[PDB]
UniProtKB/Swiss-Prot annotation, chain B:
The lineage of its organism: Eukaryota, Metazoa, Chordata, Craniata, Vertebrata. The gene is NOS3. Platelets, placenta, liver and kidney. GO terms for molecular function: actin monomer binding; arginine binding; cadmium ion binding; calmodulin binding; flavin adenine dinucleotide binding; FMN binding; heme binding; NADP binding. It comes from Homo sapiens (Human). Keywords: Calcium, Calmodulin-binding, Cell membrane, Cytoplasm, Cytoskeleton, FAD, Flavoprotein, FMN, Golgi apparatus, Heme, Iron, Lipoprotein, Membrane, Metal-binding, Myristate, NADP, Oxidoreductase, Palmitate, Phosphoprotein, Zinc. L-arginine binds at residues 169, 278-279, 283, 288. (6R)-L-erythro-5,6,7,8-tetrahydrobiopterin binds at residues 36, 287, 368-369, 382. Produces nitric oxide (NO) which is implicated in vascular smooth muscle relaxation through a cGMP-mediated signal transduction pathway. NO mediates vascular endothelial growth factor (VEGF)-induced angiogenesis in coronary vessels and promotes blood clotting through the activation of platelets. Belongs to the NOS family. Residues 32-402 are annotated as: Interaction with NOSIP. This is Nitric oxide synthase 3. Its main location: membrane. GO terms for biological process: angiogenesis; aortic valve morphogenesis; arginine catabolic process; blood vessel diameter maintenance; blood vessel remodeling; calcium ion transport; cell redox homeostasis; endocardial cushion morphogenesis. The chain holds residues 67 to 480 of 1203 of the full protein. Coiled coil: none annotated. Heme b binds at residues 106, 397.
Amino acid sequence: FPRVKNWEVGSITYDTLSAQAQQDGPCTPRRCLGSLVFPRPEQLLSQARDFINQYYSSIKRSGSQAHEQRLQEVEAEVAATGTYQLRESELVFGAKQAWRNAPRCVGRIQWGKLQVFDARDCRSAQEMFTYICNHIKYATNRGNLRSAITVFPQRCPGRGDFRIWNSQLVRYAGYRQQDGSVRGDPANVEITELCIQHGWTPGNGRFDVLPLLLQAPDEPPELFLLPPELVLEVPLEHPTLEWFAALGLRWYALPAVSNMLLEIGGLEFPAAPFSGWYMSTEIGTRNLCDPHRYNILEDVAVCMDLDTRTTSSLWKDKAAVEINVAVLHSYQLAKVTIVDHHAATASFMKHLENEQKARGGCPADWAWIVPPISGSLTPVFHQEMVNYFLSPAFRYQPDPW
Amino acid sequence: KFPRVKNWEVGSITYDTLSAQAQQDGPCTPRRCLGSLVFPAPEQLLSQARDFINQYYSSIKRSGSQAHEQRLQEVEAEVAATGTYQLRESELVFGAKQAWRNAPRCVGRIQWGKLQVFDARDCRSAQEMFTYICNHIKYATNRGNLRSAITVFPQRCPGRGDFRIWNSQLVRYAGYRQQDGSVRGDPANVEITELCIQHGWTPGNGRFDVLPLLLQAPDEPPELFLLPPELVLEVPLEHPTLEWFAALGLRWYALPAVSNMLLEIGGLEFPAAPFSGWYMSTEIGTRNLCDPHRYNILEDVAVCMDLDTRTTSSLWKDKAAVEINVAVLHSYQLAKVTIVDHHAATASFMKHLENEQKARGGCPADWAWIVPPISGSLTPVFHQEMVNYFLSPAFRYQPDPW
Ligand code: HEM
Ligand code: HEM
Ligand SMILES: CCN(C)CCN1CCCc2cc(NC(=N)c3cccs3)ccc21
Ligand SMILES: CCN(C)CCN1CCCc2cc(NC(=N)c3cccs3)ccc21
Ligand SMILES: C[C@H](O)[C@H](O)[C@H]1CNc2nc(N)[nH]c(=O)c2N1
Ligand SMILES: C[C@H](O)[C@H](O)[C@H]1CNc2nc(N)[nH]c(=O)c2N1
Ligand SMILES: [Cl-]
Ligand SMILES: [Cl-]
Ligand SMILES: [Gd]
Ligand SMILES: [Gd]
Ligand SMILES: [Zn+2]
C-alpha cells in the first residue's frame, strides 16, 4: 500500500485503491515512463461482471434482489449475441466513473454532475451531426457551460464504426505555405488537410472554425459545416493593455474531446465526445504560447516593450502571465464559464480528500495535474500522487486511417 | 524494445537504450507509477566494483587491456583479503563525475565534466574535517565566481563508524520554533537547529542566521563548528524597479552545498562527500522564498505590489512570484555572484540530453524535477519526454544520523 505524503502540510495517506489496478501502465521497476504522453474471445464477460458489481456496490445494493438478476441477462446476452447492451442507468454510472478515473483530469471534483445523451440508436452521418448539435447547444448553454457526454453505439464485429475524425468538435484551421509555415493552428494542420481533401473551401485566416468530418460505419466520412451561431467564441482583450484586442486573438468556449474511446464493462464506444469547460492555462499558456501552437509569446512581449534580448529579464514569464490574465478577463466579460489554475488545483485537492474517504485513494498523473505555469504556487505541486488504471475509463485510440 | 521518447515542441524521436543498463530498481511497477514520490556479502560488492572498473577503463579507452585485467584481479584479491578495496585517485575523480552525470533530478548536468574533486580520504578527525570543508567553501565560492566542487571524506569500512555531516547543506539558515508554533527563519531547518542548540550552540534570533556545522567523526559524538563569517558569501535581495523590495530585508547565500547525501562508487560508500555548484534562480525565488512551508513571502509581496489578492483570477500569485524571481536574478548579478535562470538552464539541459544521446544512448531524467516550478511549458524540457532510472556511480539519499 503506497505511502503518499503532502509536503506542504506534512500529512500522510495510503492509496489502498491502487491495489485494484487493471490494464497495466508503462513503468517497470527498472525505468519510469510517467512523462510519456501516449505510453506504447471469452474476455468480454470478465470486464462485464466487474462493472456490474461496481454498479450495485455504489447504489447500496450488493448481495440481494436484482444484483443476482442483472448478472444473468448479460450472461445470456453475451451467450446468444456475443456482446451486451447496458441499462441506461449503467451507461450513466459507467460514464461518470470513467471521468472519476481519468488520471490526468484536474476537474474531477465535478465528476458527479454530468449529462449523458444516449445516442446508442444512431444510424447515419446525418444522425450524428444532429446528436453532436444538440450536445454543443446543451453544453454551451449561452456561455453557462454544462458538462456533457454523448454516447454513440458500441462497436461490434462484422461492420464498421462511428468515429469523429476531429480531435475536438471545435478546432481552428492550419494552412501551409511555400515555406511550410502555418497560418492558424499548427496542431490541426493534418485534419485541415483532410477537410479540404473532402470538399471544404479553405478560409483566409488564423481562426477559421474547421468543418466536421463525421463517419458512419463502413462508409467514407461526410463533411458537415457547423452553424456559425452554434460556435460560441470569445474575442480576447486585456483589462488594461488596450492594444491586446488589436492582436485579433480569439478562442472558442466549449472544449469538446471527440476522439477518445469510452470503455464501460468491456464495451468500446469509439465515438463518445465529452465536454466540460476550460481551465484558463490551457488556452492562454498551451494553445497560445506553446512554440508548436500559436506561439504568440514574443509578439505579446514586443507590445509590452519587454527586454527580449536576455532570458533573465523573465520576459517570457511576464508576457505569459498577461496572456493568461487576458484569457480570464475575456471569458468572464463574455459570461462564459472558465476556471483559473489556482481555483482548479484547489478543488482537486478537495477532490483528493473526498476520494480518500470514499474509495481509499485517487489515480492522478502529477505531470498533468500540475498546471503549465506557476506549478509550485499551486497545492497539487507539493502533493505526492499515485498513477494507475481503473475501469471504466477513457482511452486513446488510433486515428481512423 | 527500448523506450521511444518524443520531443513534442520539435517532433524529434529517440530511443533510450541506456535505460536497459539500469543497475538498480526504482519504485514504479506496471500496476502503478510512483514517479512523483520525493523519496522512492562480498560477491555483490564484487560485481559492483567489476562494473565500475569496466566503466573506468572504457572512459580512458583501455577497455579490456592489460591494466584493466590487472585492476580486476587486484580488486578481487583485496576484497578477499580485507573485505573492501581502495579507489585509485583517478578512479575517484572519474566516479564523482559519473555520479553527477547520472543524477536524474539535476538540471545542471551540462557541467558534469567540469568538477573539482578534493580527495579527503586521509581525513582523521572532526577538526580536520572542518578544515577540508572550509577550504571547499572558499574554493567553490571564489568571491562570487562559483566553481563546481566535491570533497570526498573516508569511505565506509568495516570496524569503524561513519564520517557524517549532520547539516543537509554547508550553508543553511536557522529555523527557530517561535512560541506560537510558528517559525522565525527557514522552517525546513527546525530539526537541525534544535540539534545545534542541544549540542552547545548559542542561537540567534534573526531570520537569516547561518547555522553552525555539526561534524561527526567515526565512533565520536558530533562536534559543533562555527563557519567563519567571511567564508559565507551572501546576497542582499533588491528589486530593479520595486524599491520597497529592499526593505523586506531578504537575503540568500551564494553557495548551495549539499552535504547529507551518500556517494556510491563501485560498491564503495562515501557517507560524507559534500558537493556544490551554483543556484538556479527558481530554487531561491520560487521554492525557498514562496513555498507556503518555507519563507512564504508571496502574499506579503503581492500586497505591497498593490495586487488584488481577494480573488485568484487576477493571477496575483503568478505576478508576485515572477517579480520575486526577477529580484533574485537582479540581486545576484548586481553582487557578481554566479546564477542561472530557468530559461538558460533548461536550454542547456536540452543540449546535455543531445550530448548524452550520442554518447551513452540516453540520459536518466526525472521530468518532475527538471521542469522548473514556474513557467514549466515556457521551457523546452516541458515538451520533452524522459526516462527515469538509476545508474551507478550515484548520489543517493541516506537516513539522518540521529
Ligand atoms: C468540468 C470542468 C473540467 C475541467 C476544468 C477539466 C480539465 C482538464 C484538463 C486541464 C485536462 C488536461 C489534459 C489536456 O489538456 O490534454 C483534463 C484531462 C482530461 N479530462 Fe477533464 N476537465 C473537466 C471535465 C471533464 C469531463 C466532463 C470529462 C469526461 C466526462 C473529462 C475527462 C478528461 C479526460 C479523459 C482527460 C484526459 C485523461 C488522460 O488522458 O489520462 N474532463 N481535464
Ligand atoms: C553547476 C551548477 C548546478 C546547477 C545549476 C544544478 C541544478 C540542480 C537543481 C535545480 C536540482 C533540483 C534540486 C532541488 O530543487 O531541490 C539539482 C539536483 C541535483 N543535483 Fe545539480 N546542479 C548543479 C551542480 C551539481 C553538482 C556539481 C552536483 C554533484 C557533483 C550535482 C548533483 C545533483 C544531485 C545529486 C541532485 C539531486 C538528484 C536526485 O536527488 O536524484 N549538481 N541540481
Ligand atoms: C491533442 C491534445 N492533447 C494531447 C489531448 C487533447 N485532450 C485530451 C483529452 C483531455 C483534454 C481536455 C481539454 N480541456 C478540457 N478542459 C476538456 C475537454 C473535454 C472535457 S474537459 C483539452 C484537450 C484534451
Ligand atoms: C532535501 C530537499 N530536496 C529533496 C533536495 C534538496 N537538494 C539535495 C539534492 C540536490 C539539490 C540541489 C540544490 N541546488 C543546487 N543548484 C545545488 C546544490 C549542490 C550543487 S548544485 C538544492 C538542494 C538540493
Ligand atoms: C513530455 C510531457 O509529458 C508533455 O509535454 C506533457 C507534460 N504535461 C502535460 N500536461 C497537460 N495537462 N497537457 C499536456 O499536453 C502535457 N504535456
Ligand atoms: C511531491 C512532489 O513530487 C514534490 O513537491 C517535488 C516535485 N518536483 C520538484 N522538483 C524540484 N526540482 N525540486 C523539488 O523539491 C520538487 N518537489
Ligand atoms: Cl484545447
Ligand atoms: Cl536551496
Ligand atoms: Gd509603444
Ligand atoms: Gd519604482
Ligand atoms: Zn513511473
